[PDB]
Design a protein around this ligand. Structure first.
Ligand SMILES: O=P([O-])(O)O
Ligand SMILES: O=P([O-])(O)O
Ligand SMILES: O=P([O-])(O)O
Ligand SMILES: O=P([O-])(O)O
Ligand SMILES: O=P([O-])(O)O
Ligand SMILES: O=P([O-])(O)O
Ligand SMILES: [Zn+2]
Ligand SMILES: [Zn+2]
Lengths: 238, 238
């Protein structure tokens, strides 16, 4: 009949810009579309991330844990310098590609040192991996139980492990578009770069994360529904 | 302000008995409780599932697939004859054990020949299994992806495979309680038997099922919240 489970009741009740905004994330990312793809002409990312950062792991109390970093983790793109602030995860992925979401999505949030605005790199996490992603692994182990608490992690964290390998041609193809934080206050003016290439994590880790989101008592999600592109352009650095 | 993702939005708005009835499923099943427990004194289940070749797999448009059986598969418990009509699944589990849901719950739905009620057997699926479960596997393989569509299974689907292994005393401990269907119209007078011993399953299959629940484009759940026990008691045949 006309009964369903439906989507989580949360997001559609969010107020503020979350409802009125016209530049909201996440959005769909067409990549097998018939429409012309506007090249972002921005170059390739160059990453200067540390290999054993010492991090605070916060429990955001909204599902994901948040691994915070000290300065000196820099990513370079389009003549700007982005500094890494923190990473966290969402399951399922928040962006889709051609309408389809992935098992998880890592978000690596940066400050644009050039501008002061927020930049966010999104990486899709796919099931099927056989090597435990140590960044995600450490972030699940150190994650404090009490919401809004934060323990320092004993192990180091290499955030490079949440980025795609360079392809056979040396690229890390991506798409770029202006958007917003995916959680309240859903603030706009955020620059989004989303990597086309997923990383393969093991299925155990994805379930571990959904378990974390469900507070070790069930399996839950923490993703916002797709938003309307509106008059925005997605730019492709393939 | 405060905000969350929440749970799915559909269930709390299901109407009719879903809302008014006082014998609804699922429920939390205490086990590590001081409280004394009423023994079911019903003996152990015996299974005579035979006519499992040539059965249909149906996509219900409500998340799970449903493996329909022909007449002739019987289960016996107490003085009672349970005729298997179909099985399907939920992720995460619908019933909880001390407030803990498992990754999946299998529901084998029978007609109780002896009372003219339905009877539902309920098995928890945990991750961490080394062998694909064959019933769940074929269910996933054969299940048509188009909603409302059904397809005959080429291979035979042995429903016994969804039952936990006998304990080191020859038994499969379970709890019994009168409840309802977990989906609308939530009709009451369903006999629930929930087994206490989960079956371990490869994480691949759990994500594959959550994938199926998500129209093969996301990962989603299909579970109703827990329901008040009210006047009932839970019978334990441990
Ligand atoms: O440091 P990368 O950007 O060459 O990996
Ligand atoms: O920035 P490079 O040294 O990884 O090419
Ligand atoms: O990609 P899978 O086979 O781990 O589900
Ligand atoms: O950084 P997010 O949580 O707003 O996506
Ligand atoms: O393989 P497990 O650790 O997810 O059970
Ligand atoms: O068999 P159920 O899922 O309607 O309880
Ligand atoms: Zn995020
Ligand atoms: Zn069910």
């Amino acid at each position: 009949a006309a009964w369903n489970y439906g989507e989580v009741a949360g997001p559609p009740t969010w107020k503020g810009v979350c409802a009125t905004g016209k530049r909201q994330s996440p959005i769909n990312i067409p990549l097998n579309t018939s429409a012309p793809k506007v090249d972002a002409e921005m170059g390739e990312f160059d990453f200067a991330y540390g290999s054993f950062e010492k991090c605070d792991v916060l429990n955001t109390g909204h599902g994901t844990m948040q691994v915070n970093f000290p300065a000196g983790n820099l990513a370079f793109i389009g003549n700007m310098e982005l500094e890494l602030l923190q990473f966290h995860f969402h399951a399922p992925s928040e962006h889709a590609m051609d309408g389809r979401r992935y098992a998880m999505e890592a978000h690596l949030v940066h400050k644009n040192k050039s501008t002061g605005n927020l930049a966010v790199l999104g990486i899709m996490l796919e099931p099927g991996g056989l090597i435990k992603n140590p960044a995600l692994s450490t972030a699940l182990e150190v994650a404090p139980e009490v919401p809004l608490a934060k323990k320092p992690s004993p192990k180091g964290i290499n955030p490079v492990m949440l980025l795609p390998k360079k392809s056979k041609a040396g690229t890390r193809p991506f798409v770029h578009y202006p958007g917003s934080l995916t959680t309240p206050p859903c603030s706009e003016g955020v620059d989004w770069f989303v990597f086309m290439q997923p990383i393969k994590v093991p299925d155990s880790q994805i379930l571990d994360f959904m378990r974390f989101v469900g507070d070790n008592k069930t399996y839950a999600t923490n993703t916002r529904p797709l938003q309307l592109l509106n008059s925005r352009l997605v730019e492709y650095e393939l």
